[PDB]
RNA sequence: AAGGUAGAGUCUGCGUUGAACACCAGAACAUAGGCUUGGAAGCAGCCACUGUGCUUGGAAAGCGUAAUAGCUCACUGGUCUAGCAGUCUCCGCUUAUAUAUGUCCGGCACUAUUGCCGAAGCCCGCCUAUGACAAAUUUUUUUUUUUUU
């Protein structure tokens, strides 16, 4: 992590926004992805404009405390094509965790954003970290705790 | 149509006088019950279903042998000891072989007789065209019958 703490501090995006930190301990990937999508679009702001791309810098820690309920570790797949004949590639969720474990929440947030050309800028602002610390230690960052889970 | 697919709605064959499965297993005599066949010995084809001491043992579901047997299932005392079925009814997902370029819930995801959103409907403001209906208390305002031989 000698240079990984350096590269994540290199910012391409606009920075008039607010930084958010979310602990993903015990959170279901779908509901956390819904809340992260709402924060990323900037619709938690009274000054929201559909044309203007505001939002928040969402930082997620503990990406491997994230669970997939009802045997979706072996049955949920991730499929794409290569453009070549026979190019269907389907990866299971356990193999997706064993390849890159932050991609579960990454793809879940990607499927919930609006499908336009502002999606690249919104997916920049989602920074998902597997372990419990992030490079933005000294930053002024405001925590987003979700509403309590016990509706059931 | 089909499987120990599950969640719920009633009477009941079981069953705390030792219980389905799980455990020690008693598991038989005149006999090899009567025809055939070389042998038909609990059972190739078939006919019979005599008794017996019985808490139990079917002429007997069977691997099986020239067949007895090598083994046992079913029927019953106790062990385990609170176990406990299969008859009726739906439901959220299933099974029945080519989506044969590349995913078939739209994707991502998830194990309310009314509050709100929601249309060019309806109401409100303004405008246009064509139709109707409504509205918009002092009359009189002067001017001629005639005349000249
Ligand atoms: Mg109305
Ligand atoms: Mg109207
Ligand atoms: Mg008019």
């Amino acid at each position: 992590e000698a240079i990984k703490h350096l590269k994540d501090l290199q910012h391409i995006k606009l920075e008039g926004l607010r930084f958010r930190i979310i602990d993903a301990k015990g959170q279901v990937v779908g509901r956390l992805a819904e809340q992260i999508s709402v924060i990323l679009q900037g619709k938690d702001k009274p000054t929201y404009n559909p044309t203007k791309e505001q939002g928040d810098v969402v930082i997620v820690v503990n990406a491997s405390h994230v669970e997939l309920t009802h045997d979706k570790w072996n049955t949920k797949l991730y499929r794409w094509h290569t453009g070549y004949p026979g190019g269907l590639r389907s990866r299971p969720a356990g193999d997706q965790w064993e390849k890159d474990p932050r991609m579960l929440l990454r793809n879940a947030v990607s499927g919930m954003l609006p499908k336009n050309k502002s999606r690249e800028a919104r997916m920049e602002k989602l920074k998902i970290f597997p372990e419990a610390d992030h490079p933005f230690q000294g930053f002024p960052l405001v925590p987003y705790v979700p509403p309590p889970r016990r509706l059931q």
Side-chain angles (χ1 to χ4, degrees), chain A residues 63-126:
Chain A
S64 304
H65 288 186
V66 160
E67 59 270 4
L68 270 163
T69 72
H70 187 67
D71 64 359
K72 295 197 299 228
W73 285 114
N74 291 48
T75 61
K76 191 195 212 85
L77 305 170
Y78 288 113
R79 311 206 210 172
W80 70 100
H81 212 268
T82 78
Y84 295 70
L88 185 89
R89 312 275 175 264
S90 57
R91 178 169 314 142
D95 282 19
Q96 191 40 72
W97 200 88
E98 278 300 287
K99 174 138 181 73
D100 196 90
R102 84 172 64 82
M103 278 279 138
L104 297 146
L105 191 57
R106 182 67 178 172
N107 302 350
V109 174
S110 171
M112 293 180 183
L113 290 192
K115 274 86 188 183
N116 50 44
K117 78 166 56 44
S118 288
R119 196 158 76 164
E120 294 291 90
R122 271 149 171 179
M123 281 292 255
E124 181 181 359
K125 304 200 280 200
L126 171 66

Side-chain angles (χ1 to χ4, degrees), chain A residues 43-63:
Chain A
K43 310 199 314 178
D44 63 286
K45 304 194 187 172
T47 43
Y48 173 72
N49 215 342
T51 68
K52 301 207 185 88
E53 190 276 331
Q54 301 300 286
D56 282 302
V57 188
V58 181
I59 312 164
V60 190
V61 295
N62 306 310

Side-chain angles (χ1 to χ4, degrees), chain A residues 12-13 25 28 54 76 108 124:
Chain A
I12 291 284
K13 65 179 73 66
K25 181 266 290 180
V28 180
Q54 301 300 286
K76 191 195 212 85
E124 181 181 359

